[PDB]
Specification:
Elements: H1 5-14, H2 25-36, E1 43-45, E2 51-53, E3 58-59, H3 89-99, H4 109-114
Antiparallel strand pairs: 1-2, 2-3
Helix pairs in contact: 1-2
PDB class: hydrolase
Keywords: hydrolase, electrostatic interaction, helix, stability
Assembly: monomeric
């Protein structure tokens, strides 16, 4: 499913992401925009052989199991396919563990390079939440 901006903001809010670990909701909506363009089904393979899955492009090297990434750790204990669902719950629960891992949202390269230090507030402007 390709989410609408405000539609995604609301689902993430309900899921408890607004201000989780100190990151306002705009940060999360900006990161999804640049990571997957709001598409739950987005996948991207990396040179190391791992693949990124879903709305938040969670990597198979550490967080989920896709059965084809030798040495992966599956820290969120879920098949990577679960992250492509129209229901974002799994992606959100895993993202919560990732952002708590020590490096915050810097774990997401698109956030670091395109959202960090910008007016992320604009990403939820106009939405009824």
């Amino acid at each position: 499913k390709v989410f609408g901006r405000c539609e995604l903001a609301a689902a993430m809010k309900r899921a408890g992401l607004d201000n989780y670990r100190g990151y306002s909701l705009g940060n999360w909506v900006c990161a999804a925009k640049f990571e997957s363009n709001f598409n739950t089904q987005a996948t991207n393979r990396n040179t190391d052989g791992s693949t990124d899955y879903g709305i938040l492009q969670i990597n198979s090297r550490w967080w989920c199991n896709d059965g084809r990434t030798p040495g992966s750790r599956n820290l969120c204990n879920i098949p990577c396919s679960a992250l492509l669902s129209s229901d974002i719950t799994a992606s959100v629960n895993c993202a919560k563990k990732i952002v708590s891992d020590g490096n915050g949202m810097n774990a997401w390269v698109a956030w670091r390079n395109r959202c960090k230090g910008t007016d992320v507030q604009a990403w939820i402007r106009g939405c009824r939440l």
